[PDB]
Amino acid sequence: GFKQDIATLRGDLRTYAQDIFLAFLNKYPDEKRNFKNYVGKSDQELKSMAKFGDHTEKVFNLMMEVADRATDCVPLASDASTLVQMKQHSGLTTGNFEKLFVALVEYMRASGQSFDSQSWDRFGKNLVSALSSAGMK
Ligand code: HEM
Ligand SMILES: *c1c(C)c(O)cc(C(C)C)c1O
Ligand SMILES: CC(C)C1=CC(=O)C(C)C=C1O
Ligand SMILES: CC(C)C1=CC(=O)C(C)C=C1O
Ligand SMILES: CC(C)C1=CC(=O)[C@H](C)C=C1O
């Protein structure tokens, strides 16, 4: 279920973070508008870039904490507030987050693995709801 999937992802977090973030960037090419340093690079070149890995990992380190602190895939309002009020998220809207979670769920469905993809889908919807509530447009 959801709590085991957090354990699974954390067990190889750099790998999973980069693979899911590349699945998001490739599924939604316009989303490389929030990322000028990634333009004109292949996946292998992005994995070579220290920024790419350090940053993607820090995104998933936080996402897994927000997942871990959730009850029944419902994130804490305090974690939504943190995500809306981060200076790095100033230009963002809930659609940015929705797309990341669609990619994440798709990746999980496509994997050979017993991820609880329905729970991730619901968590992403609940996060987007909480971000909206917290004041994201
Ligand atoms: C649950 C989902 C997400 C979490 C937990 C999260 C968390 C974070 C964290 C921790 C950072 C700082 C990393 C660093 O400076 O090394 C960051 C930066 C960033 N995040 Fe988010 N984020 C999420 C979703 C997104 C989405 C959906 C977008 C855009 C589609 C986005 C765009 C950014 C940008 C543009 C930066 C800074 C630019 C850069 O230097 O790469 N994030 N995020
Ligand atoms: C997430 C979890 C962890 C849970 O127990 C239930 C749901 C759905 C089935 C309401 C989640 O998305
Ligand atoms: C990043 C942005 C300029 C952009 C938008 C897109 O629609 C596509 C296919 C490709 C892109 O590069
Ligand atoms: C997801 C990944 C590439 C990522 C890395 C980052 O370092 C920042 C600042 C923001 C991100 O979204
Ligand atoms: C406890 C039970 C009803 C339940 C919990 C879940 O987490 C999932 C994905 C599916 C379920 O039906």
Q: What are 50's two structure tokens?
A: 């220290």
The answer to whether 80 and 131 have CB atoms below 8 angstroms apart is yes
- Tell me the best of 105, 116, 122 to mutate to test the pocket of ligand 5, counting ligand atoms within 8 Å of each CB and taking the most: 116
Which residue's entry shows tokens 């971000």?
A: 131
Question: What is the stated resolution of the deposited model, in angstroms?
Answer: 1.4
Report phi then psi at 31, rounded to 5: -65, -20
Q: How was this structure determined?
A: X-ray
Number of domains in the chain: 1
Which has the closest alpha carbon to 110: 29, 14, 22? 22
Which residue's entry shows tokens 């987050």?
A: 97
Q: Is 27 in the pocket of ligand 2 (CB under 6 A)?
A: no
- Return the axis-axis angle of helices 2-11 and 50-69, rounded to nearest 10°: 160
Atom of ligand 4 nearest to the CA of 34: 12
Alpha carbon of 12 to ligand 4 centroid (Å): 18
Domain that includes residue 38, residue range: 1-137
Distance CA 74, CA 122 (A): 8
Q: Coil, strand or helix: which one is 113?
A: coil
Distance CA 96, CA 51 (A): 20
Q: Where are the alpha helices (DSSP H) in the chain?
A: 2-11, 13-27, 43-48, 50-69, 77-85, 94-110, 117-134
Distance CA 98, CA 109 (A): 17
Q: What are 64's two structure tokens?
A: 């897994």
